[PDB]
Coordinates of N, CA and C and ligand atoms in Angstrom, one line a residue:
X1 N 6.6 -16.8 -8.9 CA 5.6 -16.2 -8.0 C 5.9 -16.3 -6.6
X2 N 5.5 -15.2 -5.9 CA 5.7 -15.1 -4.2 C 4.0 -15.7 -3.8
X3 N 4.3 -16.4 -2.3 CA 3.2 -16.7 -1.4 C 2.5 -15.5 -0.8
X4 N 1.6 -15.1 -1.2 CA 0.7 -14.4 -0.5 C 0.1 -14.9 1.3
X5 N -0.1 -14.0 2.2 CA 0.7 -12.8 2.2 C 2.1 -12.9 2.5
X6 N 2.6 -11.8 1.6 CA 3.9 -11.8 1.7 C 4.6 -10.7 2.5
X7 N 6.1 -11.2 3.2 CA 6.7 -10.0 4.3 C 7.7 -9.5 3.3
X8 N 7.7 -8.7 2.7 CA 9.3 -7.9 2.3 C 9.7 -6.7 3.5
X9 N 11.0 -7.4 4.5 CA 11.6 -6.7 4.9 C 11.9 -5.5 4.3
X10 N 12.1 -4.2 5.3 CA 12.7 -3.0 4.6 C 13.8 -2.6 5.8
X11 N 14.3 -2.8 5.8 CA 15.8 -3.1 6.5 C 16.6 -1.7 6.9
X12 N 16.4 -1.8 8.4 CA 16.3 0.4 9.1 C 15.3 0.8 8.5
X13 N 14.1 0.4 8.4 CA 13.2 1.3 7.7 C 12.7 2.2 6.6
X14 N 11.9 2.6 6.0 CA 12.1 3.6 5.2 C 12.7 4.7 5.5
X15 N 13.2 5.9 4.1 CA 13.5 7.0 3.9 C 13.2 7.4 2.7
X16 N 13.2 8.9 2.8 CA 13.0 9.7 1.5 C 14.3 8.8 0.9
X17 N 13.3 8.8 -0.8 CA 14.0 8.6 -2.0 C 13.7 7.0 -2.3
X18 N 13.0 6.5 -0.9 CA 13.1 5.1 -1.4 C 11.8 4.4 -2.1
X19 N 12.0 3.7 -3.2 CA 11.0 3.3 -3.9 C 10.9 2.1 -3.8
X20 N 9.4 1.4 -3.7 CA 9.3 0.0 -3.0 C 7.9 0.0 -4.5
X21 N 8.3 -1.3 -5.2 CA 7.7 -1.6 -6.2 C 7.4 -2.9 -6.3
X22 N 6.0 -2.9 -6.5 CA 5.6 -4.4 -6.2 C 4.7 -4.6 -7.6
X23 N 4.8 -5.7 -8.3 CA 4.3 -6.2 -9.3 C 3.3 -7.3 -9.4
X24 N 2.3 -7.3 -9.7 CA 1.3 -9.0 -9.6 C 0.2 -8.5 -10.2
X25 N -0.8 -9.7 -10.4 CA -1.8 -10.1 -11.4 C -2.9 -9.9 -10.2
X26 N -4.1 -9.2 -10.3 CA -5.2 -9.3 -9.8 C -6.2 -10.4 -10.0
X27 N -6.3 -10.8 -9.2 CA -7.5 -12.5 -9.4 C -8.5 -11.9 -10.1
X28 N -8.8 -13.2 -10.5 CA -10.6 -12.7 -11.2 C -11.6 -12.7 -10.2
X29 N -12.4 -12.4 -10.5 CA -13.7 -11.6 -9.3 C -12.8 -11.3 -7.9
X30 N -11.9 -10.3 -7.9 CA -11.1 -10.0 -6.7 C -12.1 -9.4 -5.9
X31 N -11.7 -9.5 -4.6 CA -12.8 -8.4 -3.8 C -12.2 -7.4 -2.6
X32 N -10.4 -7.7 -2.4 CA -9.6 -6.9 -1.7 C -7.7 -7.0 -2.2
X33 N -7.4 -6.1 -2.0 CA -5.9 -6.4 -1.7 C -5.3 -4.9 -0.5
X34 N -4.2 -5.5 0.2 CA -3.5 -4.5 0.7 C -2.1 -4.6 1.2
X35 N -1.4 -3.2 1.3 CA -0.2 -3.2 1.4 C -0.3 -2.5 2.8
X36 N 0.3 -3.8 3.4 CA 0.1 -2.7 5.3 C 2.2 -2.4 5.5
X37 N 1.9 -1.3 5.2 CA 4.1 -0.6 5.7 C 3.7 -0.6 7.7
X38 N 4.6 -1.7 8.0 CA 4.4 -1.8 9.9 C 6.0 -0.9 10.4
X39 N 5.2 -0.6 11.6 CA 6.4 0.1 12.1 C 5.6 -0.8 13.1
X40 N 6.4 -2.6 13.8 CA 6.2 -3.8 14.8 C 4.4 -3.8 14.2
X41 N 4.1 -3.5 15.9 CA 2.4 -4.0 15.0 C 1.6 -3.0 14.3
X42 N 2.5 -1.6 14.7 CA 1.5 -0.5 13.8 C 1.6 -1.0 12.7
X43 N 0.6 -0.1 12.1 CA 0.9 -0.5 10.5 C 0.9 1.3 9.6
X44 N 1.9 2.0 9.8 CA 2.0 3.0 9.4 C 1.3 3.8 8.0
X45 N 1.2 3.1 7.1 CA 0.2 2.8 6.5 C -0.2 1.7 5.7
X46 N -1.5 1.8 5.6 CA -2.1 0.9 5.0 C -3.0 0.9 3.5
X47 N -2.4 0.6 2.5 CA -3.1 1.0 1.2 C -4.2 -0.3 0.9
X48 N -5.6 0.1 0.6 CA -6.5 -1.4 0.5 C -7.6 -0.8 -0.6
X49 N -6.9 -1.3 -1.7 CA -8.2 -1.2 -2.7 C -9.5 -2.2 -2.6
X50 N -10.3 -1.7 -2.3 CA -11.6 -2.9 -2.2 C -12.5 -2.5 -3.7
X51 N -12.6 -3.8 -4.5 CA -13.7 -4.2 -5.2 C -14.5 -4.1 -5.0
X52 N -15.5 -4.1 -4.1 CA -17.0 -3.9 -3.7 C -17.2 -3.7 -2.2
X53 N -17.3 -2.6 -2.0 CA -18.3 -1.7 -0.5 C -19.1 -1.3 -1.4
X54 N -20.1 -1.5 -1.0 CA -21.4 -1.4 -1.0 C -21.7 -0.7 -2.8
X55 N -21.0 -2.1 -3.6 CA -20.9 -2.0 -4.9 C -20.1 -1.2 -5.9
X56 N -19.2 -0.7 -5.1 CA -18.7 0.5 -5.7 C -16.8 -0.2 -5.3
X57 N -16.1 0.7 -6.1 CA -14.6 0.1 -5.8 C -13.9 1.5 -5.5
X58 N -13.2 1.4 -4.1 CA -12.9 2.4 -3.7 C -11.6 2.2 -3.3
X59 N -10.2 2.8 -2.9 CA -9.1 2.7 -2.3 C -9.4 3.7 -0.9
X60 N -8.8 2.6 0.4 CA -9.1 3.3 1.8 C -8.0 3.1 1.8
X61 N -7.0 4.4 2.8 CA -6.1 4.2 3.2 C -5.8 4.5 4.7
X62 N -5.1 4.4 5.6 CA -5.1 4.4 7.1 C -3.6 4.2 8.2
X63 N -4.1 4.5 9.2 CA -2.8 4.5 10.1 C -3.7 3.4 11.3
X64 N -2.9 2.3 11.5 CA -3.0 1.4 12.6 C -2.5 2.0 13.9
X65 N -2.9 2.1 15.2 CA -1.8 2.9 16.3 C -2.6 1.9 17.7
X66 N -1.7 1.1 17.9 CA -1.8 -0.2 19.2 C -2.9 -0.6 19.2
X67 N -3.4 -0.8 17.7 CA -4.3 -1.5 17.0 C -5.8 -0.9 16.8
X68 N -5.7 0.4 17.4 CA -6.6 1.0 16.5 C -6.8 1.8 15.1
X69 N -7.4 1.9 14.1 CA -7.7 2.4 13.1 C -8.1 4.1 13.2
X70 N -6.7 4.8 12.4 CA -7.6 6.2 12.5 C -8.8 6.6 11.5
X71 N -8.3 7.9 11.0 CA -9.5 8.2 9.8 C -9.1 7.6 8.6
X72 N -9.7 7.4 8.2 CA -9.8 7.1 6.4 C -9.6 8.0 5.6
X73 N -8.4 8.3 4.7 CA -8.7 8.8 3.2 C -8.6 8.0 2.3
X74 N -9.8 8.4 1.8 CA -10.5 7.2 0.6 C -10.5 8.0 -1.0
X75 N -10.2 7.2 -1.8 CA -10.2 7.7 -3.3 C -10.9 6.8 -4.1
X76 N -11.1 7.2 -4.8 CA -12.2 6.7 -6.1 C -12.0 6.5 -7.1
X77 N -10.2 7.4 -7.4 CA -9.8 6.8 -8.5 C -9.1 5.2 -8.6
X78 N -9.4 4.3 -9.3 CA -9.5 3.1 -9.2 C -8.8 2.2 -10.5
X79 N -7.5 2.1 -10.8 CA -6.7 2.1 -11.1 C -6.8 0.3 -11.8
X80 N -7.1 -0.4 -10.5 CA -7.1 -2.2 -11.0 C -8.4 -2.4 -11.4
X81 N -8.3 -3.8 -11.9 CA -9.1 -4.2 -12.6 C -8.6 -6.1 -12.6
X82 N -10.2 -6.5 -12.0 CA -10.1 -8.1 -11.4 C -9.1 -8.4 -12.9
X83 N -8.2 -9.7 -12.9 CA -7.7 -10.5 -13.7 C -6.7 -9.3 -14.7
X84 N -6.2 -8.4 -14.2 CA -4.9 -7.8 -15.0 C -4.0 -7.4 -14.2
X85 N -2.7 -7.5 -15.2 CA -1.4 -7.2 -14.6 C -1.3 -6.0 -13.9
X86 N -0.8 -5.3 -12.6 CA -0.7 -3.9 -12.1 C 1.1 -3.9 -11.8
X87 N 1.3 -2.7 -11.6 CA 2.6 -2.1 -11.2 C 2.2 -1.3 -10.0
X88 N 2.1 -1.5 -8.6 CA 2.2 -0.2 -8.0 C 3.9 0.1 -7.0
X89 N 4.1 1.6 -7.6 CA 5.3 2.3 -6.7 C 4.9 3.0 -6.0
X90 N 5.5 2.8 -5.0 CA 5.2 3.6 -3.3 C 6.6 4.3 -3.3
X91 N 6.5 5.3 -3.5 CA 7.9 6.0 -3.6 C 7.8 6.9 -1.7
X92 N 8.4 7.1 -1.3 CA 8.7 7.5 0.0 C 9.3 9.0 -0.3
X93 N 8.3 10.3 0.2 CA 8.7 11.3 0.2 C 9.2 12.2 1.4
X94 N 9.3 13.5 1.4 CA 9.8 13.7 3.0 C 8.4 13.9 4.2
X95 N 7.5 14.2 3.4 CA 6.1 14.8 4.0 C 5.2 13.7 3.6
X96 N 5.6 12.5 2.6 CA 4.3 11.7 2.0 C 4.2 10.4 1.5
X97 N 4.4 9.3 1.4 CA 4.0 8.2 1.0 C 3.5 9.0 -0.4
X98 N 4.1 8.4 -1.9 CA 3.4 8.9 -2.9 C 3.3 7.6 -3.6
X99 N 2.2 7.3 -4.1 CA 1.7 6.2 -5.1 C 1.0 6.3 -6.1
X100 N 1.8 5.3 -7.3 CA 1.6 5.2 -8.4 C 1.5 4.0 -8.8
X101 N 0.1 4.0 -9.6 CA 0.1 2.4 -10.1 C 0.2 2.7 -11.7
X102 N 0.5 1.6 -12.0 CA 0.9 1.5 -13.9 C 1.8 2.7 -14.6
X103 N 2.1 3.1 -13.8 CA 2.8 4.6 -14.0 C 2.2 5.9 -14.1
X104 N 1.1 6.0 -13.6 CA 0.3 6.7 -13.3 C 0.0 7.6 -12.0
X105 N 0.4 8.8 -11.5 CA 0.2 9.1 -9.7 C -1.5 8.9 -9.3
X106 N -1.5 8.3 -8.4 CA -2.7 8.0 -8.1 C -3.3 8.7 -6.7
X107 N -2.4 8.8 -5.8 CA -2.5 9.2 -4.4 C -1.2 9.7 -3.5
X108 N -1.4 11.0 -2.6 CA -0.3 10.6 -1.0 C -1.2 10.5 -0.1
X109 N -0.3 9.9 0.8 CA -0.5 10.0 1.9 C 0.2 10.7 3.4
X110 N 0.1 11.5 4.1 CA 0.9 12.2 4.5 C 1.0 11.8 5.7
X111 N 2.8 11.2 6.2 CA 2.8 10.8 7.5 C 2.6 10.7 8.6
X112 N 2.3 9.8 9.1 CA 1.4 9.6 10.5 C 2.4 9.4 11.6
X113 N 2.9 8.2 11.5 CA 4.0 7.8 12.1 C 5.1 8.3 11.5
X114 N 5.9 9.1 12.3 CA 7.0 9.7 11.6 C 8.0 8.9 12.1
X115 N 8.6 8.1 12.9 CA 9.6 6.8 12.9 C 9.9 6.3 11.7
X116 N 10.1 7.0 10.3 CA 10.6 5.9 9.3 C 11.3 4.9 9.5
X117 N 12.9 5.4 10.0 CA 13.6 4.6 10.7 C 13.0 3.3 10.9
X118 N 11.6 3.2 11.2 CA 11.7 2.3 12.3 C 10.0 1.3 11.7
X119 N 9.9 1.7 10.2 CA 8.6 1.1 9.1 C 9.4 0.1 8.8
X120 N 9.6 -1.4 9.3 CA 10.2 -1.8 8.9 C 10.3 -3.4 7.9
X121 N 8.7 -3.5 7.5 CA 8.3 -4.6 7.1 C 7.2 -3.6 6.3
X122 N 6.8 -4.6 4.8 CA 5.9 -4.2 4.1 C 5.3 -5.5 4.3
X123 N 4.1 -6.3 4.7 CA 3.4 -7.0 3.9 C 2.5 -6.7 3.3
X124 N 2.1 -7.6 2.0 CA 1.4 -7.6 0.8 C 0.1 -8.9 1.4
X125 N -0.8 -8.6 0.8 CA -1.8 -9.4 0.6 C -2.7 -9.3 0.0
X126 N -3.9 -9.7 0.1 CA -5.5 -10.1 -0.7 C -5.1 -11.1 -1.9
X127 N -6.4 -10.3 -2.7 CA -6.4 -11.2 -4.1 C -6.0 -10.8 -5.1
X128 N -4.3 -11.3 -5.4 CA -3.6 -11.2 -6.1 C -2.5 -12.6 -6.7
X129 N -2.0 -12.5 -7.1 CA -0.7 -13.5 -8.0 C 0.1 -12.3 -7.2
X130 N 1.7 -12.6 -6.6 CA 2.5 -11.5 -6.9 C 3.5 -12.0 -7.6
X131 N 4.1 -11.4 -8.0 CA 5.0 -11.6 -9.1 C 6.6 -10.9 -8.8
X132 N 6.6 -10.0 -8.3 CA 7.8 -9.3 -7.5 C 8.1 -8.2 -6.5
X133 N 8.3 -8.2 -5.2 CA 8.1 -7.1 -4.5 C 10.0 -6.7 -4.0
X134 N 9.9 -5.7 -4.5 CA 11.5 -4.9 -4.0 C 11.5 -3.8 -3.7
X135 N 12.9 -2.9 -3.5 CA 12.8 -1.9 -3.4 C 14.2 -1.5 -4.0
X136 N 14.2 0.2 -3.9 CA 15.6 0.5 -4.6 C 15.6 2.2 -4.3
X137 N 16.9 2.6 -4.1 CA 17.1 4.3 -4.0 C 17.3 5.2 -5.1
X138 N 16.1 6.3 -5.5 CA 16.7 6.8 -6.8 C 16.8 8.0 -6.4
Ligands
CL201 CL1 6.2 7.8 15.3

């Protein structure tokens, strides 16, 4: 198991083709997790499934920019589930951030920060186990 939160370097950044796959167990009665991709302190995006706003489980996604928050796109399809194993791939497209959990497409997101080059840290956190975070070119 990895320490939460965890930094997986992405070394020059992202690019098209690159797939960043992260594996772990969701806590029981979870109530957040997120994947913030930083380009230094931005956070280019940000994927955050929350367990309960205002009782409901929703995935917010977002662009950090000298530490403000832009708009939110939010989805509803809702993939985890407190205390089971997930897969989610963040595959990196030319126009989009595309993600899939359990093998499943779930979401894009369409570039904000266009510096891939220059995304160059993923960290992981909330309430999870992680179990393996890497990446690979297909
Ligand atoms: Cl940029």
């Amino acid at each position: 198991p990895l320490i939460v939160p965890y930094n997986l370097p992405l070394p020059g950044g992202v690019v098209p083709r690159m797939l960043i796959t992260i594996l772990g167990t969701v806590k029981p009665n979870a109530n957040r997790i997120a994947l913030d991709f930083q380009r230094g302190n931005d956070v280019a995006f940000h994927f955050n499934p929350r367990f309960n706003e205002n009782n409901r489980r929703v995935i917010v996604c977002n662009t950090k920019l000298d530490n403000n928050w832009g708009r939110e796109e939010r989805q509803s399809v809702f993939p985890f589930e407190s205390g089971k194993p997930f897969k989610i791939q963040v595959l990196v497209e030319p126009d989009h951030f595309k993600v899939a959990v359990n093998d499943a497409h779930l979401l894009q997101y369409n570039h904000r920060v266009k510096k891939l080059n220059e995304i160059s840290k993923l960290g992981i956190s909330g309430d999870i186990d992680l179990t393996s975070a890497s990446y690979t070119m297909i």
